[PDB]
Amino acid sequence: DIQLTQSPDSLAVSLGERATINCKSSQSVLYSSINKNYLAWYQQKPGQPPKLLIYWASTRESGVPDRFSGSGSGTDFTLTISSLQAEDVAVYYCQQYYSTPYTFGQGTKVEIKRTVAAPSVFIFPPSDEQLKSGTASVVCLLNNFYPREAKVQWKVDNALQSGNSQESVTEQDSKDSTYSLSSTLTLSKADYEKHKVYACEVTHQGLSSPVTKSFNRGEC
Amino acid sequence: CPFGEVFNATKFPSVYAWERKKISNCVADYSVLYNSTFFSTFKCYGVSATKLNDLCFSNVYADSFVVKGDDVRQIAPGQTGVIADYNYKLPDDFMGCVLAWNTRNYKYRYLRHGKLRPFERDISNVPFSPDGKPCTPPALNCYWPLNDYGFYTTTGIGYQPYRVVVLSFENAPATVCGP
Amino acid sequence: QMQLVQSGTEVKKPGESLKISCKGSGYGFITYWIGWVRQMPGKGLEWMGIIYPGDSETRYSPSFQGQVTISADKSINTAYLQWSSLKASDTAIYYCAGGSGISTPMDVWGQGTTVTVVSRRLPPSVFPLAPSSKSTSGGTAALGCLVKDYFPEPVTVSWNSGALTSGVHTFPAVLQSSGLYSLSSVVTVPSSSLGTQTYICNVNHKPSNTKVDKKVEPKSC
Ligand SMILES: *[C@@H]1O[C@H](CO)[C@@H](O[C@@H]2O[C@H](CO)[C@@H](O)[C@H](O)[C@H]2NC(C)=O)[C@H](O)[C@H]1NC(C)=O
Ligand SMILES: *[C@@H]1O[C@H](CO)[C@@H](O)[C@H](O)[C@H]1NC(C)=O
C-alpha cells in the first residue's frame, strides 16, 4: 500500500554541519481534515532500541533537542540535524502511520567526518594456554584513529605475510568519532614455533612514518 | 472541563438516539481518562491519547449511548453490525476516541431502509414494511423498527450493558487546548 | 508515562514452538496498542503487526499473516508473539513498541528480545591478551580477551561484571573459514596501575549455555 524509500543509504558529515535525509512515499500520507502528515522519524544508535524523534512530520517528541528538525509535505519529507554532534552517529528511519500495515524506510546511517587522529598500536603474543591448542593467534590493535582506512601488514622474520590474518573494525565511537581495528594472524603451533620475530607494520594518514610494533617468540 | 457531567452523567441515551456535547471555551486535561482503571476499552484513532493535551481544536464533541457489551466492537470505523448500520456509524476516516465502561451496576433500531450516514441519527418509530409499503397498524408484514436490550444483572458480561462515549475533534483561533 | 519490558533471550532448535512476551506497566496503559517489529542482524526495521489488548483486535502485515500469531492478555498487560514451529530464517531481535492509539507513532519501546534458532552449538574458548611493554604505548596499556571457535552468534562479554565500560572495544566477530566465530575484547588502562588493579573478562555464550570468567594478568616482557 504505502511504501517508503529514503535517500541516501549513507552520508558522512563533519561535526557542526547539517545532515539531511530524504523520505519519499508512494502515496500521500496527509489526513486532509486536521492537516497533518502521518509520518515519524526514529533514531537507532548501536545496540539500543529505536527512539521516536519526530511525529506529524514536524513535531518533536518531548526531550528531543532543537537541532533535530522535520519538514516536508505530500509525498516528500526531510529530516535535518543541525549542529551535528558526535553522539548523533546512528541509523535513522522514516515511518508512515497513515495506513496499516505500517511501513519503515530502509534506513540511513549517519557517519562523522572529524579531524585526523593517529592510531595507537599494540601487539599481543599468543598465550601459552592457546599454545596448548596447537594454534597461535598473534593480535595487533589499532586504537582510536581517524579516518577509517588503515593498512596493517604482518611480517614474520621480515617476510611479508598474506593469507593468514583477519581484520575487524568497530562502530564509530560516539564520544570522539574514532575507529578501532583488530588484525589477528593465526598459525599452527609448529609454524609459529619455527619463526623468531613477529611485526605489525601500521600505515596511516596521521603517521609521518609507518609504525611497527614487534616481538620475539619466547621474550615473554 | 465539564467531562465531570459527561462521563459522570446520571443516565445516558441509548444508541438509536445518541447525541453530542461541546467542549468549547475550555482547557482540557485528558488524564482523568488516562488514569481511569475502570474503562473497559479506550480506542483512539488517528491521534495519540497521551499527548492530546498538546493539541488545540475549535470544539470537541462527545456522543453518549449504551450498548450490549458484545457490540462495543462495532463503534469503530468500517464496521458492519446492526448498531453501526441503523443506529450509530463512524466515518471511514474517523479520528477520535471510543471509551467504553461497564454499566451492570435502553433500545436499539434493528430495521431500517438502508444504512445511516456517518454521524447521522434516525429517531422515528414508524412501522416497517420489508419492501416499502405504508404499514397500516398491526396488520400483516408489519414490524416496529425499534427494540430493547432488556439488561439483567445475572447473565453474560457481553450481554451486560456498557456505556460508550465517543469523542471527536474540530479555521479560526482554537478555543479549547491543553494546559 | 509507561514502560515496556520484554522476555529474555531465547535459544531454540529448528522446529519447536515459541511464545515471547511483552509486559507494559505504568499509568494510562489501556490506551496503548502494541506492535511487533523484527530486526535481523545488520538489517533495518520490519513492521510485523499490531494488537489492542482491550479486545485483542489485531492487524497483520501481509508478509507475516499466518506465519506468526500475535496474542494479548489484559489480565497482566501482556502482548505475545508466537511461532508454532521456528525457521532458521526467524533468527533476529524482536521489539514490541506502543502507540497511544491506532494510526499514531510508536511512543514506547521495549528493550528487545534476542531469538536464536540454530542446529548445532559449540562453546567458545577464551584466552587472555595480557599487557606488556609490547602492549604499552606511552602511559597507556592495553589488555583483552580472545573468544575463539564458537557457534553461533552472539557471545556477550563484560569486564569486571559490568563495572568497567569506559575504554572498552568489543570487536564485531569475524567468521573463520572453519565456519566458527571469533572476536576479541580489548580495553586501554593506565600502565602505572597494572599492579594494583584486577581485570576480569566475563564471557557468556547462551546458545551453548556457558559462561567463563578469565582473569587477565600482566607479563614481564
Ligand atoms: C496519572 O498518574 C501519573 C503518575 O502517577 C501522574 O503523573 C504526575 O506527573 C507530574 C509531572 O510529571 C508530577 O508532578 C506528579 O507528581 C505525577 N503524579 C504522580 C501521582 O506520580 C499524572 O498527572 C496522572 N494524571 C492525572 C489523573 O492527572
Ligand atoms: C468522574 O467521577 C470520578 C470518580 O472518582 C472522578 O474521579 C472523575 O474525576 C469524575 N470526572 C470524570 C471526568 O470522570
XYZ file of C-alpha atoms and ligand atoms in Angstrom:
662
model
C 0.000 0.000 0.000
C 2.157 2.855 1.339
C 5.828 2.146 0.593
C 8.573 4.490 1.824
C 12.032 4.931 0.283
C 14.657 7.146 1.915
C 17.877 8.549 0.490
C 20.754 8.224 0.647
C 21.897 4.853 2.022
C 24.757 6.505 3.925
C 26.041 10.035 4.428
C 29.134 11.320 6.236
C 29.018 14.838 7.686
C 31.526 16.957 9.577
C 30.799 17.984 13.149
C 28.752 21.176 13.262
C 27.464 20.881 9.686
C 23.955 19.787 8.664
C 22.818 16.233 7.933
C 19.695 15.926 5.765
C 17.802 12.728 4.910
C 15.031 12.466 2.316
C 11.984 10.200 2.592
C 9.675 9.607 -0.381
C 6.317 7.838 -0.120
C 4.422 6.090 -2.920
C 1.141 7.740 -1.856
C 0.253 10.833 0.171
C 0.050 10.461 3.952
C -1.938 13.622 4.711
C -5.280 13.447 6.514
C -6.949 16.483 4.971
C -9.137 17.454 7.949
C -6.586 18.006 10.726
C -3.919 18.870 8.087
C -1.061 16.804 9.497
C 1.075 14.242 7.680
C 1.226 10.864 9.422
C 4.986 10.370 9.300
C 7.537 9.823 12.070
C 11.330 9.812 12.315
C 13.198 7.329 14.535
C 16.851 7.133 15.589
C 18.709 3.898 16.396
C 22.154 4.045 17.991
C 24.185 0.806 18.081
C 22.894 -1.815 20.497
C 19.748 0.075 21.532
C 16.034 0.097 20.654
C 14.755 2.789 18.274
C 13.763 6.180 19.669
C 10.897 8.315 18.384
C 12.275 11.730 17.413
C 9.578 13.346 15.276
C 5.894 12.747 14.542
C 3.408 14.514 12.263
C 6.499 15.218 10.133
C 7.403 18.371 12.037
C 6.563 17.878 15.745
C 9.288 16.862 18.189
C 8.811 14.279 20.899
C 9.332 15.693 24.384
C 13.015 15.646 25.325
C 14.373 15.847 21.764
C 16.865 18.718 21.303
C 16.099 21.603 18.975
C 18.786 20.736 16.406
C 16.548 17.920 15.137
C 14.022 19.286 12.647
C 11.412 17.669 10.405
C 9.794 19.205 7.340
C 8.091 18.311 4.078
C 4.586 17.504 2.921
C 2.544 15.445 0.490
C 4.916 12.778 -0.737
C 8.325 14.273 0.156
C 9.823 14.808 3.608
C 13.230 15.623 5.075
C 14.927 15.153 8.430
C 17.634 17.712 9.218
C 20.114 17.549 12.083
C 21.648 20.954 12.721
C 24.848 21.407 14.741
C 25.833 17.797 14.147
C 27.286 16.219 17.284
C 29.323 13.063 17.802
C 26.638 11.172 19.749
C 24.298 11.522 16.731
C 26.085 8.654 14.950
C 23.203 6.250 14.305
C 20.787 4.894 11.695
C 17.682 6.988 11.036
C 14.396 5.622 9.672
C 11.191 7.258 8.494
C 7.854 5.557 9.074
C 4.277 6.163 7.968
C 1.417 5.561 10.391
C -1.268 6.682 7.939
C -2.475 3.204 6.955
C -1.991 -0.173 8.323
C 0.235 -2.001 7.503
C 2.817 0.465 8.813
C 5.997 0.869 6.776
C 9.568 1.867 7.625
C 12.118 3.348 5.303
C 15.161 1.193 4.664
C 17.317 3.410 6.872
C 20.159 5.914 6.571
C 23.413 5.535 8.501
C 24.891 8.891 9.540
C 28.673 8.995 9.966
C 31.015 11.698 11.248
C 33.829 13.497 9.461
C 36.361 14.677 12.046
C 39.981 15.767 12.208
C 42.728 13.223 11.606
C 43.684 11.075 14.603
C 46.753 8.836 14.566
C 46.266 5.276 15.866
C 47.829 3.810 18.968
C 49.299 0.425 18.029
C 49.688 -2.529 20.389
C 50.611 -6.177 19.842
C 49.793 -9.298 21.865
C 51.772 -12.549 21.573
C 49.877 -15.841 21.838
C 49.074 -17.050 25.324
C 50.673 -20.304 26.433
C 47.232 -21.775 27.148
C 46.442 -21.267 23.474
C 49.872 -22.714 22.721
C 48.453 -25.925 24.141
C 45.740 -25.574 21.474
C 48.126 -26.345 18.636
C 47.265 -22.841 17.411
C 48.857 -19.430 17.900
C 46.923 -16.188 17.422
C 49.048 -13.032 17.386
C 46.826 -9.969 17.751
C 47.532 -6.367 16.732
C 45.322 -3.469 17.853
C 44.907 -0.026 16.288
C 43.156 2.206 18.814
C 41.107 5.368 18.327
C 42.161 6.677 14.916
C 40.561 8.638 12.073
C 39.941 8.246 9.161
C 38.807 4.622 8.953
C 41.129 3.465 6.151
C 44.314 1.982 7.623
C 46.844 -0.586 6.439
C 48.105 -3.430 8.645
C 50.956 -5.519 7.232
C 52.112 -8.666 9.011
C 55.798 -9.566 8.899
C 57.392 -12.762 10.205
C 61.203 -12.820 10.045
C 60.797 -9.700 7.879
C 58.791 -11.847 5.433
C 55.551 -10.114 4.478
C 52.532 -12.268 5.329
C 49.481 -12.887 3.136
C 46.598 -15.293 3.702
C 46.557 -15.786 7.487
C 45.207 -12.549 9.033
C 41.681 -11.318 9.755
C 40.653 -7.723 10.491
C 37.629 -6.300 12.306
C 36.623 -2.653 12.800
C 34.400 -1.141 15.481
C 31.456 1.185 15.084
C 32.357 4.861 15.140
C 32.860 5.984 18.728
C 30.004 8.203 19.875
C 32.198 10.422 22.088
C 35.247 11.141 19.896
C 34.199 9.780 16.455
C 37.202 7.453 16.079
C 37.525 3.834 14.993
C 39.327 0.778 16.328
C 40.755 -2.074 14.267
C 41.924 -5.571 15.173
C 44.120 -7.762 12.964
C 44.745 -11.356 14.042
C 47.354 -13.654 12.488
C 46.536 -17.323 13.102
C 49.161 -20.045 12.686
C 49.919 -23.591 13.696
C 51.832 -24.138 16.906
C 54.527 -25.680 14.697
C 54.884 -22.844 12.178
C 54.749 -20.291 14.993
C 57.465 -22.355 16.688
C 59.547 -22.131 13.510
C 59.991 -18.359 13.466
C 61.580 -15.663 15.564
C 60.309 -12.068 15.110
C 56.676 -11.072 14.544
C 55.976 -7.497 13.469
C 52.830 -5.428 12.982
C 53.547 -2.614 10.493
C 50.796 0.015 10.540
C 50.455 2.671 7.838
C 48.008 5.525 8.388
C 47.327 9.069 7.214
C 48.112 10.552 10.639
C 51.536 8.889 10.797
C 54.615 10.531 9.306
C 56.276 7.113 9.131
C 54.928 3.552 9.201
C 54.898 2.470 12.845
C 55.999 -1.058 13.706
C 55.444 -2.963 16.945
C 57.291 -6.275 17.050
C 58.167 -9.038 19.482
C 60.388 -12.121 19.519
C 58.986 -15.560 20.321
C 59.974 -16.506 23.851
C 60.653 -12.940 25.000
C 57.610 -13.153 27.283
C -13.529 20.851 31.876
C -17.182 19.683 32.080
C -16.404 15.978 31.465
C -17.428 15.558 35.110
C -21.029 15.546 33.873
C -20.499 13.641 30.600
C -18.641 10.554 31.876
C -20.309 11.050 35.287
C -23.809 11.566 33.801
C -26.693 10.130 35.871
C -28.140 8.306 32.859
C -27.445 8.052 29.149
C -29.425 7.967 25.912
C -29.449 4.686 24.051
C -27.965 4.084 20.719
C -30.712 4.913 18.230
C -30.996 8.422 19.733
C -27.489 9.277 20.966
C -26.481 12.943 20.990
C -23.444 15.183 21.353
C -21.825 17.653 23.745
C -19.379 20.559 23.273
C -16.144 21.278 24.949
C -15.875 24.924 23.933
C -14.321 27.740 25.978
C -12.277 25.218 27.978
C -8.829 23.907 28.688
C -8.795 20.112 28.713
C -6.820 17.630 30.794
C -7.483 14.156 29.384
C -5.622 12.301 32.154
C -8.933 11.921 34.038
C -9.301 9.350 31.257
C -5.655 8.179 31.138
C -5.712 7.338 34.899
C -9.150 5.590 34.939
C -8.597 1.932 35.842
C -12.317 1.247 35.244
C -12.514 1.855 31.481
C -13.225 -1.391 29.640
C -11.869 -0.040 26.350
C -10.108 3.161 25.259
C -9.608 3.134 21.466
C -8.313 6.322 19.823
C -7.964 6.608 16.040
C -5.572 8.965 14.282
C -4.304 10.758 17.441
C -2.089 9.559 20.308
C -4.047 9.682 23.571
C -1.227 10.548 25.985
C -0.284 13.699 24.004
C -3.810 15.043 23.422
C -3.016 17.879 25.839
C -0.511 19.082 23.221
C -3.245 19.910 20.701
C -5.735 22.707 20.068
C -9.169 22.440 18.443
C -12.197 24.674 17.981
C -14.676 22.263 19.572
C -14.770 18.715 20.930
C -17.925 16.615 20.616
C -18.909 13.631 22.776
C -21.658 11.219 21.707
C -23.136 9.183 24.561
C -25.049 5.896 24.450
C -25.426 2.417 25.978
C -24.809 -0.806 24.018
C -24.697 -4.509 24.774
C -21.092 -5.336 25.619
C -20.682 -7.643 22.617
C -21.318 -4.777 20.165
C -18.771 -2.333 21.618
C -16.542 -3.737 18.861
C -18.740 -2.071 16.218
C -18.459 1.519 17.454
C -15.428 1.811 15.184
C -14.719 2.986 11.620
C -15.595 0.491 8.914
C -17.715 -1.968 10.897
C -20.696 -3.985 9.769
C -23.173 -4.579 12.606
C -26.798 -3.591 13.072
C -25.695 -0.892 15.533
C -23.204 0.521 13.022
C -25.731 0.490 10.166
C -29.029 1.662 11.684
C -28.066 3.401 14.947
C -24.578 4.954 15.032
C -21.992 4.900 12.229
C -18.445 6.230 12.463
C -16.721 7.688 9.380
C -14.116 5.729 7.454
C -11.501 8.451 8.031
C -12.594 8.946 11.636
C -10.261 10.483 14.193
C -11.105 10.455 17.864
C -11.727 8.255 20.873
C -14.130 5.491 21.807
C -14.389 4.948 25.562
C -16.458 2.090 26.981
C -17.021 1.008 30.580
C -19.230 -1.458 32.435
C -22.745 -0.403 33.480
C -24.170 -3.584 35.042
C -24.331 -1.772 38.381
C -32.395 1.104 26.503
C -33.458 0.403 22.934
C -31.855 -0.017 19.516
C -33.024 0.088 15.896
C -32.753 -3.207 14.009
C -34.888 -2.477 10.911
C -34.329 0.445 8.538
C -34.496 1.162 4.806
C -30.794 1.493 4.056
C -27.783 2.413 6.150
C -27.065 5.584 8.102
C -24.654 8.306 7.114
C -21.666 8.865 9.412
C -22.816 10.954 12.396
C -26.451 10.721 11.244
C -29.360 9.819 13.518
C -32.823 8.303 12.996
C -35.393 8.985 15.745
C -38.656 7.941 14.079
C -40.702 4.964 15.319
C -42.845 4.110 12.274
C -43.906 0.517 11.375
C -41.565 -1.183 8.919
C -42.582 -2.843 5.659
C -39.826 -5.046 4.164
C -40.433 -3.602 0.667
C -41.724 -0.063 1.182
C -45.409 -0.172 1.920
C -47.105 2.309 4.274
C -47.911 -0.143 7.049
C -51.457 0.019 8.383
C -51.318 -0.689 12.184
C -50.680 -4.352 13.299
C -51.901 -5.951 10.028
C -49.584 -8.261 8.049
C -45.876 -7.808 7.209
C -45.771 -5.126 9.914
C -42.995 -4.642 12.463
C -41.883 -1.725 14.565
C -38.189 -0.990 13.950
C -37.041 -0.202 17.481
C -36.331 -2.819 20.101
C -34.948 -3.213 23.660
C -31.867 -4.872 25.087
C -33.508 -5.963 28.338
C -30.417 -5.974 30.550
C -30.160 -8.032 33.730
C -27.509 -8.287 36.410
C -27.331 -12.085 36.053
C -26.076 -13.197 32.653
C -23.107 -12.894 30.244
C -20.734 -9.926 30.566
C -21.018 -9.495 26.808
C -24.797 -9.307 27.255
C -24.308 -6.804 30.073
C -24.787 -3.090 29.363
C -21.839 -0.862 28.552
C -21.698 2.926 28.480
C -19.910 4.372 25.450
C -18.705 7.938 24.892
C -17.204 8.824 21.506
C -15.054 11.965 21.375
C -14.444 13.661 18.033
C -12.413 16.812 17.475
C -12.783 20.021 15.460
C -10.348 27.545 10.634
C -10.099 30.124 13.428
C -8.290 30.657 16.761
C -8.629 27.355 18.604
C -10.895 27.659 21.639
C -10.072 24.518 23.672
C -6.469 23.453 24.290
C -4.404 21.600 26.850
C -2.522 23.126 29.810
C 4.411 7.663 31.458
C 4.554 3.895 30.865
C 7.359 1.378 30.296
C 7.624 -1.827 28.253
C 9.703 -4.873 29.233
C 10.049 -7.959 27.035
C 11.027 -11.520 27.877
C 14.635 -12.643 27.991
C 16.893 -14.176 25.379
C 15.588 -17.314 23.670
C 17.727 -20.032 22.076
C 15.671 -22.694 20.308
C 16.154 -25.621 17.835
C 14.580 -25.552 14.339
C 11.017 -26.829 14.662
C 9.856 -26.022 18.219
C 7.206 -23.599 19.425
C 7.974 -20.203 20.924
C 5.862 -17.510 22.592
C 7.723 -14.309 23.522
C 6.037 -11.857 25.886
C 5.941 -8.082 26.318
C 4.590 -6.620 29.568
C 3.672 -2.967 29.980
C 3.487 -1.109 33.266
C 2.606 2.452 34.223
C -0.272 4.883 34.197
C -2.502 5.017 31.128
C -1.873 1.554 29.686
C -5.356 0.799 28.339
C -4.928 3.359 25.539
C -1.846 1.651 24.074
C -1.655 -0.573 21.004
C 1.303 -2.966 20.962
C 3.059 -3.620 17.654
C 5.874 -6.053 16.848
C 8.997 -5.182 14.840
C 11.635 -7.630 13.588
C 15.292 -6.645 13.161
C 17.521 -9.277 11.649
C 21.232 -8.735 12.432
C 22.552 -5.931 10.245
C 19.158 -5.203 8.660
C 16.603 -2.425 9.062
C 13.207 -2.454 10.747
C 10.256 -4.588 9.631
C 6.758 -3.979 10.976
C 5.004 -7.286 11.710
C 1.616 -6.463 13.212
C -0.266 -4.696 15.971
C -2.812 -5.622 18.643
C -5.036 -3.746 21.075
C -5.159 -5.726 24.351
C -8.558 -4.295 25.315
C -10.436 -6.510 22.853
C -7.491 -8.284 21.149
C -8.198 -6.686 17.782
C -5.068 -7.482 15.783
C -3.853 -6.414 12.342
C -1.159 -8.324 10.464
C 1.263 -7.206 7.808
C 0.796 -9.107 4.526
C 4.292 -10.572 4.917
C 3.544 -12.077 8.358
C -0.106 -13.130 8.009
C -0.427 -16.750 9.107
C 3.330 -17.109 9.639
C 3.175 -15.886 13.262
C 0.310 -15.134 15.638
C 0.093 -12.030 17.824
C -1.796 -12.501 21.077
C -2.661 -10.400 24.098
C -3.977 -10.704 27.629
C -5.323 -7.638 29.505
C -5.208 -9.558 32.823
C -1.489 -8.893 33.152
C -0.995 -6.174 30.499
C 0.954 -8.537 28.261
C 1.255 -8.910 24.498
C 2.664 -12.052 22.879
C 4.309 -13.114 19.627
C 4.179 -16.788 18.705
C 5.564 -19.246 16.194
C 4.299 -22.811 16.379
C 7.487 -24.007 14.663
C 10.607 -21.890 14.181
C 12.582 -21.499 10.955
C 16.270 -20.636 10.660
C 15.086 -17.502 8.836
C 13.427 -16.325 12.081
C 16.697 -15.608 13.925
C 16.567 -11.919 14.859
C 15.826 -9.370 17.551
C 12.153 -8.653 18.179
C 10.939 -5.353 19.626
C 7.487 -4.553 20.958
C 6.527 -0.887 20.611
C 3.493 1.053 21.747
C 1.258 3.734 20.252
C -1.310 5.608 22.334
C -3.858 4.891 19.578
C -4.103 3.348 16.154
C -2.513 5.355 13.326
C -0.136 7.036 15.787
C 3.657 6.907 16.145
C 5.262 4.402 18.496
C 5.932 6.276 21.732
C 7.309 3.475 23.920
C 9.764 0.722 23.006
C 10.843 -2.499 24.649
C 14.482 -3.335 25.284
C 14.302 -6.114 22.688
C 14.220 -9.907 22.719
C 17.022 -11.822 21.010
C 15.770 -15.038 19.384
C 18.325 -17.509 18.002
C 17.316 -20.762 16.302
C 20.205 -22.974 15.219
C 21.125 -26.627 14.696
C 24.489 -27.101 16.442
C 26.143 -25.220 19.311
C 29.861 -25.185 20.112
C 31.187 -23.402 23.222
C 33.889 -20.732 22.875
C 37.441 -20.780 24.186
C 38.721 -17.688 25.992
C 42.393 -16.707 26.092
C 43.962 -13.694 27.825
C 45.587 -10.943 25.788
C 47.990 -9.860 28.509
C 49.583 -6.397 28.698
C 53.313 -5.847 28.381
C 55.777 -3.272 27.068
C 54.768 -4.512 23.615
C 51.143 -3.813 24.592
C 52.052 -0.414 26.095
C 52.428 2.858 24.177
C 53.128 5.922 26.302
C 51.452 5.706 29.686
C 48.587 3.636 28.286
C 48.495 -0.158 28.408
C 46.092 -2.408 26.521
C 44.757 -5.813 27.562
C 41.881 -8.006 26.487
C 40.291 -11.359 25.919
C 40.169 -13.545 22.793
C 36.986 -15.594 22.364
C 37.546 -18.145 19.625
C 35.867 -21.105 17.885
C 32.235 -20.610 18.916
C 28.901 -21.032 17.144
C 26.528 -19.422 16.782
C 26.451 -15.711 17.492
C 26.341 -13.956 19.845
C 28.691 -14.006 22.814
C 28.209 -11.210 25.321
C 31.408 -10.105 27.053
C 31.576 -7.774 30.045
C 34.543 -6.604 32.115
C 34.562 -6.939 35.914
C 30.884 -7.937 35.695
C 29.791 -4.679 34.074
C 31.744 -2.312 36.342
C 34.360 -1.391 33.698
C 32.885 0.034 30.478
C 34.932 3.127 29.546
C 37.712 2.462 27.044
C 36.339 -0.959 26.088
C 36.184 -2.114 22.465
C 34.461 -5.425 21.704
C 35.098 -6.006 18.025
C 32.412 -7.455 15.742
C 33.211 -11.143 15.469
C 34.845 -12.475 12.323
C 33.852 -15.676 10.536
C 36.647 -18.225 10.403
C 36.701 -20.456 7.322
C 36.158 -23.338 9.746
C 32.627 -21.921 9.924
C 33.055 -20.867 13.561
C 33.143 -17.361 15.005
C 35.829 -15.433 16.859
C 36.161 -11.980 18.395
C 38.394 -10.009 20.737
C 37.528 -7.573 23.536
C 40.237 -5.028 24.362
C 40.497 -2.171 26.847
C 43.116 0.511 27.465
C 44.066 1.326 31.064
C 46.907 3.275 32.721
C 50.111 1.251 32.701
C 51.107 2.509 36.162
C 48.076 0.893 37.813
C 48.687 -2.596 36.376
C 49.957 -3.941 39.697
C 47.067 -2.755 41.872
C 44.073 -3.257 39.552
C 42.447 -6.561 38.588
C 40.861 -7.067 35.163
C 38.470 -9.997 34.669
C 36.573 -10.582 31.438
C 33.184 -12.303 31.609
C 32.161 -14.273 28.516
C 28.641 -15.703 28.301
C 27.551 -17.783 25.282
C 23.888 -18.640 25.885
C 23.434 -20.995 22.869
C 25.878 -23.452 24.462
C 24.798 -22.398 27.988
C 28.324 -21.423 29.006
C 29.897 -18.632 30.990
C 33.557 -18.160 31.882
C 35.458 -15.555 33.897
C 39.083 -15.070 32.846
C 41.482 -13.013 34.955
C 43.969 -11.243 32.664
C 47.273 -10.586 34.438
C 50.322 -8.774 33.023
C 53.517 -10.339 31.708
C 57.093 -9.130 32.063
C 58.427 -8.603 28.547
C -1.761 9.980 36.257
O -0.765 9.446 37.123
C 0.533 9.974 36.861
C 1.614 9.227 37.646
O 1.071 8.550 38.785
C 0.560 11.482 37.101
O 1.925 11.902 36.916
C 2.285 13.132 37.588
O 3.221 13.837 36.774
C 3.544 15.142 37.241
C 4.505 15.787 36.249
O 5.478 14.824 35.829
C 4.162 15.046 38.627
O 4.406 16.361 39.132
C 3.195 14.332 39.554
O 3.781 14.202 40.852
C 2.857 12.956 38.997
N 1.911 12.354 39.916
C 2.073 11.136 40.420
C 0.932 10.623 41.244
O 3.078 10.477 40.226
C -0.476 12.117 36.166
O -0.629 13.535 36.305
C -1.829 11.485 36.469
N -2.889 12.087 35.680
C -3.920 12.704 36.257
C -5.097 11.843 36.603
O -3.915 13.900 36.493
C -15.986 11.201 37.465
O -16.037 10.571 38.721
C -14.784 10.041 39.112
C -14.895 9.311 40.437
O -13.641 9.337 41.131
C -13.790 11.163 39.241
O -12.550 10.678 39.724
C -13.639 11.856 37.927
O -12.785 12.980 38.096
C -15.006 12.344 37.561
N -14.911 13.072 36.328
C -14.718 12.489 35.185
C -14.438 13.405 34.053
O -14.758 11.300 35.066
